[PDB]
Amino acid sequence: PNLSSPQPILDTIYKLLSEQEQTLVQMIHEQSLLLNRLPPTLDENSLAPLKSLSQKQITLSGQMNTEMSALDATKKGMILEPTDLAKLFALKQDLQIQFKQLSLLHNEIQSILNPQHSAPKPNVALVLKSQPFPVVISKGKQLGENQLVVLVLTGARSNFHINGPVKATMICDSHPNPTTPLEMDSQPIYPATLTAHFPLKFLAGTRKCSVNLKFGVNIRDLDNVTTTVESDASNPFVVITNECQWEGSAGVLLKKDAFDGQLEITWAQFINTLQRHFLIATKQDPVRPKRPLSSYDLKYIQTHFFGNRSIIHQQDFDKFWVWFGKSMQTLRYQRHISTLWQEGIIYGYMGRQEVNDALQNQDPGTFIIRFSERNPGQFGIAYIGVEMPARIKHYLVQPNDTAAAKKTFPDFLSEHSQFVNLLQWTKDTNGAPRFLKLHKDTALGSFAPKRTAPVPVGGYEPLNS
Amino acid sequence: PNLSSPQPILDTIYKLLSEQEQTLVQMIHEQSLLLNRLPPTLDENSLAPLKSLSQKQITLSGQMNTEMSALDATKKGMILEPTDLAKLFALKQDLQIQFKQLSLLHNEIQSILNPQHSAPKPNVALVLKSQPFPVVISKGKQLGENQLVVLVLTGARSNFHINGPVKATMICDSHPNPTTPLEMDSQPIYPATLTAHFPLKFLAGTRKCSVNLKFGVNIRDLDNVTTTVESDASNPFVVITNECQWEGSAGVLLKKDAFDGQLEITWAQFINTLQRHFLIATKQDPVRPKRPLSSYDLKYIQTHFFGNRSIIHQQDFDKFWVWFGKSMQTLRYQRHISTLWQEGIIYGYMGRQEVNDALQNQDPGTFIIRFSERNPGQFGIAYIGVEMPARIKHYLVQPNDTAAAKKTFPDFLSEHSQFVNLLQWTKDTNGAPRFLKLHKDTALGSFAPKRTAPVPVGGYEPLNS
C-alpha cells in the first residue's frame, strides 16, 4: 500500500511508442512502394526487398510484445500513483493499436511471400482510438463529439470497399431490455483519418449490469463477397436511472474491471483499479487529482477488508463494497462532502484507535471528522469534550443533522460549540500533508456563514445564535 | 465603603454595661434598704445617705449618656462589619433599659428629697427586653416563645398594683384594616422577672405599610387611681400576604428604618442599615454571615446609585430600590440563587467594564455570572466565546431558561458548552476572597447533575446530551 515511482519503465516505453509511431508511418509508405514495384509474377531477386521488410516487421512485432508484457507486469506488480496510472492505461491502449497496424501490414506481405497461408480475409481492423469507459453513466446523457472514436486500420493497399456506416452495439453478456438503448449508433467515416466519432445518447438504464459496446462495418471484397468486421469490446460500463443505483452498479463495474472473470488478483492489480474508479466517482482529474486515495487510505482498506494479504479473492470484495461503496456514495452525492473531503476538512478513512491517538490530549474542542466503521456511509466526529477530566468523545452524525437539503453538513458543524478547532489534513513543504489545528471557522473558510449586519457591541446577545 | 474595626469603642462599652448591670443590682437593694431605714418624717442627718445616693445616681446617669452618644456617633460615622454591627444594636438596646431603670430609681429618691417635684405618677415602665423587628413577616407565621419579651421596670418600692395582662397593639401611623391583626396579644406576667412573652400570630397583611407594636398595662395606684402605662413603639416591620409584596414592603421598611422621618442621613448610617436588612432578607446569621455585602459591593452601590457622596438624600432611595430591591427579591425567592451567591458561584454586584477587565483575555469558555444593570432582577453571564478572534460576550438569562420551577438556574448552566470554567469568588489564607478558575462542574459540585448508570465507552454518544 505504498505508491512507487515506475517513472522509468514508463518514460522508456513512452519514447519507444513515439519512435515506433514514426517507424510505422514510413513503413506503410515503404511497403506500398515495394508492392507497386513488383514485377507481374514474382521471380526471386524480386522478393529480396519484401523478405527484408518481413524480417524487420517480425523483429519489431517482438519488441511490441516485450513492451506489452512489461506494461502488464507493472500494473499487476506495482502500486502506481495517479499520473503513472493514467499513463500506463494510455500507453497500453496505443501500443495495442500500433501492434494491430503492424499486424495488418505483415499479413499483406505474408500473403505474397508465403501464400496458401491466406484466407485471413481482407486486411481491415476496427479499433477504439479513444473511449470514456469505464464509468457509470446516467440515463439521458449524451457523449461529446470526441469522446468515443473508432479508427479503421488497413494495409498498404486496400483490396476492398466499405459499405454503409460504422455501427455501435450495446452488449450484456449476463443476459438473457426489449428496445433500443442507443441513439446515434451509425456514423460515417472521416477520409483523412478513417475515423468515426460517436456522440452517443444513452436512452436506457442497464439494470445494474456491466455492459460493453461493439462496433462493426461491412466490407465488400474485390470479388463481391461481403464480410462484417467488428471491433473487440469496449471497456465495461453501466447506465443508471437514479442515484439509487450508483452503488450497486459502480460495484458490479469495479468488480468486473478489477477481476475480469478471475477469482484472485494481486493487491496492486486491485487498488490500481480502485484508484482509477475512485477518481472517476469523485469526478477528479485522473493525472493531477486534488485528493486521490493516499498511502494511508490504501493501508486502511487493506487492513480492514483484506487479510492484509498481497493477493485478493473474489468474495472478499462483496464485504469490502458493502461498506466502501457507501463511503463513495456519500462523497459522490451528499452536498459539499466531496469538496470538504478533498480539502482536508473531512479526514475520511481512519479507525477508532487511530483517531484516539491522533487526539491524545489536545485542548478540548479539538475534533477530527471521519467515516463510521459500523455505520457505512455516515460520519463520526471524534472530539474532546468540556467535562473534566476531559476525555475523547465520538458522535455519529445523522441524516437529520443535515436532513432537509436546505441545511448542509458544514452548517451543522459551525452550529455546535463542542466543535471549536479542527485538525485539518494539509500538505507541507515537500508536498507533505499533515495535521495543522485550524479553527473550525477558519477551515470552513468559504462554507462559512456569511453575515449581513456587523457584530453587536455593548448589549446582550443570544447564545450560540 | 470600607468596613472598619470599632472593635475598641464597642468592647469598652460592653464591659461598662456588664459592670453597670451589677451596679444597678446592688443599687436597687442599697436603695430599698435606705428607704426602710428612714425615720417617720425625715429630719436632716436622716437624709445624708439619700443625698449621697442621689449624687452617685446623677453621676452614673451621665456616664450612660456619654456611652449612648458614643454609640450613636459610631453608627452614624463608621461602616461596621456584621459582627460589630450586631453588637452595636444589642449594646444600644441594653443601655437604654439600664438608663430607664436608673431613672425610675432616681425619681423615687427625688420624690423624697425634693417633693413638689412629684406628679410623675407611679414609678413603672414597660420596655422591650427583646424583639424580632425589623423584618418583613409573612401573614400566618407565629412568633417563638422567647422572641418578643416585655419587661416591667420598677423602683425599689412598688406603691401600686397591676391589673389585667399586658396588651400588644399594632400601630400604623400612615392611616387612616377593619379587624384584628393579632392573636395572643394579652399575656400574664412572670413574677421572678416581671416579664411577659408574646408568641404573636400575625393574622393580617399590612398593605405594604410599616408598622410598630405598642404594649401597655393598667396600674392601680395606692389611692385607687387607675393609670395606663405604655411602652415606646417597637422597631418597624411589615406583614405581607404573598411574595409579590416582599419588595415594596421591604423597601418601605428599609427606607423608614434608614431615614426615620429624615431627609438626609450619612452614608455610614445608610449602609449600616442596609447591611442589616440585607442579611435579614438572605436569612443569614447576623454575627457570622456566610456572605454579607462586601467592601466591593458597597462601593458598587455607592457609585451606581449615589453621587458617591458621603451624604444620602431621601429621593435617591427611590431609584436605588427600583433596581436593588429586585436583586434582593431574586436572591430571596429564586430557587438556589441565595445559596449559589453565598458560595461565590454567582459573583453578583459588578458592572460591565469591570466584568470585562476581569475577563480580559482568559481561555475561551471562562464566564462570570452577575446582575444585569439594565434588567433589574436578572443575571447576565459574561463569557468568552469560541469564534476567533475570541471576544467577550454577554448573555441575559431569561425567565424561560429556568422557567418551570422544574428546571433551575444551576441546571441551565451545566447545559451549555459555552460555559466551561467559572471564575469563582473564593476566600484565601487571610480570609481573602479572590478569583480561582474552577470548572463549571467542579464549582456546581453539589448542584451537579448526578448520574445513574456509568459512562459509556467504545461507541457513540449524543451531543451535549
Q: Is the peptide bond before A120 cis (omega within 30 degrees of 0)?
A: no
Class (C level, CATH) for A115-243? mainly beta
Residue whose C-alpha cell reads 401597655 in the numeric block = B216
Which among B460, B464, B465 is the top mutation candidate for probing chain A, defined by the most A β-carbons within 10 Å of its own β-carbon?
B460
3-state secondary structure (DSSP) of residue B447:
coil
For residue A47, list its beta bridge partners: none
- Chain B nearest-CA distance from A297, in A, is 23
Give the Cα-Cα-Cα angle A336, A338, A342 (nearest 5 degrees): 115
Residues 390-419 of A with CB under 8 A from B: 393-396, 416-418
Across the interface, which of B388, B396, B442 has its CB nearest the CB of A439? B388
Measured between beta carbons, the chain B residues lying within 8 angstroms of A441 are 387-388
Closest chain A CA to residue B353: A458
Q: How far is CA A214 from the centre of its chain?
A: 20
Residue B108, Ramachandran bin (φ over 0: left; ψ between -120 and 50: alpha; else beta): alpha
- Method used to determine the 3D structure: X-ray
**Chains A–B, number of C-beta pairs less than 8 Å apart:** 55
- Cβ contact (<8 Å) for B441 and A365? no
Measured between beta carbons, the chain B residues lying within 8 angstroms of A459 are 394
| Helix, strand counts (H, E) of chain A | 11, 18
What type of residue sits at position A314?
Answer: Q
Nearest alpha-carbon partner for B58 in B12, B101, B102: B102
Cβ–Cβ under 8 Å, residues A312 and A265: yes
Cell of B288: 457570622
Cβ–Cβ under 8 Å, residues B268 and B78: yes
Q: How far apart are the two ends of chain B, measured CA to CA in Å?
A: 46
Ranges of beta strands (E only) in A404-448 are: 421-426, 434-437
Cα gap A359→A368, rounded to integer Å: 8
A352 touches chain B (CB under 8 A): yes
B55: Cβ contacts below 8 Å, ≥ 6 apart: none
Cβ–Cβ under 8 Å, residues B304 and B322: no
Across the interface, which of B420, B439, B460 has its CB nearest the CB of A396? B460
Residues of chain B with CATH 3.30.505.10: 333-465
Cell of B388: 476567533
Cβ–Cβ under 8 Å, residues A204 and A239: yes
User: Which class for B163: exposed (0-12), middle (13-18), buried (19 or more C-beta within 10 A)?
Assistant: exposed
- Cβ contact (<8 Å) for A380 and B460? yes
Q: How is domain B333-465 classified at the CATH fold level?
A: SHC Adaptor Protein (3.30.505)
B422: Cβ contacts below 8 Å, ≥ 6 apart: B345, B366, B367, B368, B369, B437, B438, B439, B440, B443
- Cβ contact (<8 Å) for B464 and A418? yes
- Cβ contact (<8 Å) for A352 and B393? no
Q: Please count the other Cβ atoms lying within 10 Å of the Cβ belonging to residue B92.
A: 16
Measured between beta carbons, the chain B residues lying within 8 angstroms of A389 are none
Residue whose C-alpha cell reads 514485377 in the numeric block = A39
Cell of B358: 476581569
Cα gap A187→B162, rounded to integer Å: 135
Q: Please count the other Cβ atoms lying within 10 Å of the Cβ belonging to residue B444.
A: 21
Residues of chain B with CATH 2.60.40.340: 115-243
Quick one: CATH architecture of B245-332? Answer: Orthogonal Bundle (1.10)
Residues of chain B with CATH 1.20.58.240: 1-113
Cα gap A262→B74, rounded to integer Å: 105
DSSP per-residue letters across B211-268 = BEEEEEEEEEETTS-EEEEEPPP---BEEESSTTTHHHHHHHHHHHHHHSS-SEEEHH
Q: Please count the other Cβ atoms lying within 10 Å of the Cβ belonging to residue B407.
A: 14
Chosen CATH of B1-113 out of 1.10.10.10, 2.60.40.10, 1.20.58.240, 3.40.50.620: 1.20.58.240
What type of residue sits at position A317?
Answer: F
